[PDB]
Amino acid sequence: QGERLWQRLMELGEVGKQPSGGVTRLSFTAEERRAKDLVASYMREAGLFVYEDAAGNLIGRKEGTNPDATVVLVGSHLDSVYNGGCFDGPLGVLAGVEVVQTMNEHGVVTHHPIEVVAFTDEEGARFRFGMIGSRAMAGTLPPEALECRDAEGISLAEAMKQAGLDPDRLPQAARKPGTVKAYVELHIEQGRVLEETGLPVGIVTGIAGLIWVKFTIEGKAEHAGATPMSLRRDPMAAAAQIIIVIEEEARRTGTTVGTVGQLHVYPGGINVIPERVEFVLDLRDLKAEVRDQVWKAIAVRAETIAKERNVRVTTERLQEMPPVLCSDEVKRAAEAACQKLGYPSFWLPSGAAHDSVQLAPICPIGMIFVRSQDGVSHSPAEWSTKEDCAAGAEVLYHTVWQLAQG
Amino acid sequence: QGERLWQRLMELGEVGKQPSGGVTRLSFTAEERRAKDLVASYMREAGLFVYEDAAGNLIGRKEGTNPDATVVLVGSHLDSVYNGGCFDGPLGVLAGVEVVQTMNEHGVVTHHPIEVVAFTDEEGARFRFGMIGSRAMAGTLPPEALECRDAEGISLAEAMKQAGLDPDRLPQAARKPGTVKAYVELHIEQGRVLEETGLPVGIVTGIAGLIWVKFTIEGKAEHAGATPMSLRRDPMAAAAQIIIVIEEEARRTGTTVGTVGQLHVYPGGINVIPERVEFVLDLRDLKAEVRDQVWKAIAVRAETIAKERNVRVTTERLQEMPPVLCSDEVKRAAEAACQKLGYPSFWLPSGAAHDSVQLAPICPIGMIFVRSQDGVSHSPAEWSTKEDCAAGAEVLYHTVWQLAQG
Numbered sequence: 107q108g109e110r111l112w113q114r115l116m117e118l119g120e121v122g123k124q125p126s127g128g129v130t131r132l133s134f135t136a137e138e139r140r141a142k143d144l145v146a147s148y149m150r151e152a153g154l155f156v157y158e159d160a161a162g163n164l165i166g167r168k169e170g171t172n173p174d175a176t177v178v179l180v181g182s183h184l185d186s187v188y189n190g191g192c193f194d195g196p197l198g199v200l201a202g203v204e205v206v207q208t209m210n211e212h213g214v215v216t217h218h219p220i221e222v223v224a225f226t227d228e229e230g231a232r233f234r235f236g237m238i239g240s241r242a243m244a245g246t247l248p249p250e251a252l253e254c255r256d257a258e259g260i261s262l263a264e265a266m267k268q269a270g271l272d273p274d275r276l277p278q279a280a281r282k283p284g285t286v287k288a289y290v291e292l293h294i295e296q297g298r299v300l301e302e303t304g305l306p307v308g309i310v311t312g313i314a315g316l317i318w319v320k321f322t323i324e325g326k327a328e329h330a331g332a333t334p335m336s337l338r339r340d341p342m343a344a345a346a347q348i349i350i351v352i353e354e355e356a357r358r359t360g361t362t363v364g365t366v367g368q369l370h371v372y373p374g375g376i377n378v379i380p381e382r383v384e385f386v387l388d389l390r391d392l393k394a395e396v397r398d399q400v401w402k403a404i405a406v407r408a409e410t411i412a413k414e415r416n417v418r419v420t421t422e423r424l425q426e427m428p429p430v431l432c433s434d435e436v437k438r439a440a441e442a443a444c445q446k447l448g449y450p451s452f453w454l455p456s457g458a459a460h461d462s463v464q465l466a467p468i469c470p471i472g473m474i475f476v477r478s479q480d481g482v483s484h485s486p487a488e489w490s491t492k493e494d495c496a497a498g499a500e501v502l503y504h505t506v507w508q509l510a511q512g
Numbered sequence: 513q514g515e516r517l518w519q520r521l522m523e524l525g526e527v528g529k530q531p532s533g534g535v536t537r538l539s540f541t542a543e544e545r546r547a548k549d550l551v552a553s554y555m556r557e558a559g560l561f562v563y564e565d566a567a568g569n570l571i572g573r574k575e576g577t578n579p580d581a582t583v584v585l586v587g588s589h590l591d592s593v594y595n596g597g598c599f600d601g602p603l604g605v606l607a608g609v610e611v612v613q614t615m616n617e618h619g620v621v622t623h624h625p626i627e628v629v630a631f632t633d634e635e636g637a638r639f640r641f642g643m644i645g646s647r648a649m650a651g652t653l654p655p656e657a658l659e660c661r662d663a664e665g666i667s668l669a670e671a672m673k674q675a676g677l678d679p680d681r682l683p684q685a686a687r688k689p690g691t692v693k694a695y696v697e698l699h700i701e702q703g704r705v706l707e708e709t710g711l712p713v714g715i716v717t718g719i720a721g722l723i724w725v726k727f728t729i730e731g732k733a734e735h736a737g738a739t740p741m742s743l744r745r746d747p748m749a750a751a752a753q754i755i756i757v758i759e760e761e762a763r764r765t766g767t768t769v770g771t772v773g774q775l776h777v778y779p780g781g782i783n784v785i786p787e788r789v790e791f792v793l794d795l796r797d798l799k800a801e802v803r804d805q806v807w808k809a810i811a812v813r814a815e816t817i818a819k820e821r822n823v824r825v826t827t828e829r830l831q832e833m834p835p836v837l838c839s840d841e842v843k844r845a846a847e848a849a850c851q852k853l854g855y856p857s858f859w860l861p862s863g864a865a866h867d868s869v870q871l872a873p874i875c876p877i878g879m880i881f882v883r884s885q886d887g888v889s890h891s892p893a894e895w896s897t898k899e900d901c902a903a904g905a906e907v908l909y910h911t912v913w914q915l916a917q918g
């Protein structure tokens with residue numbers, strides 16, 4: 107049941123496998139190269155036409171009955187984070203291949219052509235800049251990104267150069283709007299929503315909007331013994347209260363996620379009230395108006411907490427990504443796909459960002475989620491079951507088939 | 513009186529004066545010598561018998577009317593930390609000298625002899641070991657610290673031989689529980705309590721008792737975007753609430769202070785709900801029982817929160833120290849000193865230990881604090897006003913006077 111797909115996942119999982127069992131494949135390395143060629147051999151087996159674009163993106167084309175028809179794109183990525191799993195990335199790609207090759211084996215024809223794409227560098231690990239391949243196909247790679255360097259200090263442009271890739275030709279990788287019918291990506295959930303409901307497959311409603319705000323809280327460093335409670339300007343105590351406000355305000359909507367996952371304290375002694383505490387709100391929600399409305403509540407409540415406790419709080423916005431709603435054509439297709447196959451229709455937002463987010467400016471997008479065991483992602487523990495991947499490939503298949511009809 | 517004290521503080525404040533801004537006066541060095549010879553010189557001018565003990569403490573005796581009577585001790589320290597102010601230490605030693613000399617110049621004799629003392633190495637900067645002098649006199653100088661080594665690697669013992677002080681003749685510095693009637697020290701507050709009250713002076717009640725307890729809070733590391741508020745098990749959020757609780761409970765008594773001044777998050781990512789948080793609670797009160805009561809109250813609420821949030825909290829006592837009170841005899845004396853001069857008496861704990869702690873076994877002890885500008889200390893920003901200093905010294909005068917009566 108979903109053998110070929112599972113066998114390919116296990117096999118690809120060997121490429122850059124660590125002693126941990128996890129994987130590490132950075133862009134523009136021999137390992138991702140080995141991976142790209144391995145996936146490419148699966149693309150040939152499926153009867154696809156194989157090429158790489160100007161951004162290093164790997165593509166398999168299956169012609170439709172109208173060579174001039176607009177393209178249905180299915181992909182995901184091959185690169186990983188450092189000690190990553192072997193499902194985040196390849197599921198989408200390998201299921202993509204699985205979908206077309208099934209079609210060719212059973213002599214199934216489609217009006218539109220279907221391209222399976224493995225995008226260059228979604229996770230962003232090597233140059234700390236993410237989603238290089240998909241921005242490129244979308245035509246929104248900033249030249250600021252070419253100047254990013256890795257640990258060994260080689261720049262993206264330099265890496266690209268070494269790889270045979272003239273950064274000058276990067277615009278050639280772009281697809282113009284209206285050459286693409288749509289884009290669909292099968293991905294593991296990366297959370298426990300689906301495992302908690304007890305279902306293998308969900309439909310993505312969209313990719314949540316995001317904000318990173320850095321909180322800097324300034325007080326007065328002072329010896330603990332010397333400083334009565336009534337006199338203090340304790341910014342760690344201030345931080346603790348704000349972190350609670352964050353939780354209260356994210357819980358309130360039923361829809362939002364809010365997290366403080368990093369927090370530095372200055373100076374950092376056991377017996378010293380801190381001078382400064384810095385931390386970063388990670389705050390997301392599918393409706394931007396809700397996200398910001400949530401942020402306003404945190405801001406207003408923080409402002410008073412500041413004045414009450416005689417400390418200074420400045421915030422800075424580090425990153426903003428607007429939400430991307432999934433399209434009705436893709437969603438309606440995945441729903442039909444499930445009903446046909448006897449799966450319940452389960453809707454859910456994608457908290458994390460994906461290559462799909464970078465394709466919205468140029469075509470309608472959509473996504474399908476596969477149950478994630480214990481929600482684990484980006485580590486060796488990452489696991490989706492063979493049958494669950496099977497479930498997701500059937501749906502993908504029937505979602506792609508629909509979209510590629512006239 | 514007032515002016516003579518000030519001129520001396522400055523004269524002395526030049527002795528280890530660093531282009532850095534502060535004072536570096538480490539024990540058994542050329543800079544210490546220059547500083548004792550200097551104060552020794554003021555002492556000789558005061559009309560005192562002057563000597564150094566076998567630990568290098570500097571004594572100026574004003575003979576009492578009963579030469580056999582018990583000795584009233586009056587001191588502080590001449591040495592410093594690396595980039596220190598010129599009031600921490602001197603103020604006491606120079607104010608003490610001011611007292612006796614003012615007495616001599618006026619017609620003043622007291623039943624008990626008075627000795628001004630300058631303790632060698634209270635800050636402990638040279639050897640990781642502090643209160644060498646005061647311990648030596650109290651009889652509690654461990655033979656293990658003869659082994660303690662310099663940054664240049666010289667051993668305490670070798671530094672004393674160098675200064676021509678026989679380490680074997682150390683026990684001779686000691687004095688009986690009988691030998692000494694009382695000990696008083698005038699010190700800068702080293703805190704803002706007097707500043708915010710509006711007062712130049714105050715009477716130290718003791719040092720608080722102290723516990724350090726490590727909390728380790730464990731939940732589940734998961735994707736911050738993909739995990740809904742209603743599924744996560746967030747150790748930071750939990751920790752934040754324990755930290756608030758710490759504050760709520762130290763505030764409740766009026767007398768307790770509780771401090772979190774370091775906080776480690778694991779793994780550390782802006783988009784990762786943490787797996788673990790670790791922080792250390794510094795908790796202090798003058799009455800042990802009353803702090804012990806605050807720890808129970810914290811610990812229980814912590815447990816209650818652990819259970820509610822489904823996370824794991826493990827507490828761990830790192831260190832425990834008892835309070836040490838200042839004796840009523842000295843306290844009554846300072847009390848009387850303030851009433852005589854028209855100063856309201858104001859009580860406060862000292863944040864730090866001083867030479868007087870090391871004196872508690874052998875006699876009644878007490879201290880007087882003077883207002884510190886902005887609480888700042890142990891740096892060159894360290895400042896006390898001429899007026900404030902005079903005020904302290906005048907209070908010290910009549911304190912010493914009352915304690916020297918038969």
Ligand SMILES: C[As](C)(=O)[O-]
Nearest residue numbers: 457458459460783
């Ligand atoms: C790039 As992500 C794992 O924060 O959506």
Ligand SMILES: [Co+2]
Nearest residue numbers: 194195228460
């Ligand atoms: Co991914």
Ligand SMILES: [Co+2]
Nearest residue numbers: 589600601866
């Ligand atoms: Co001192």
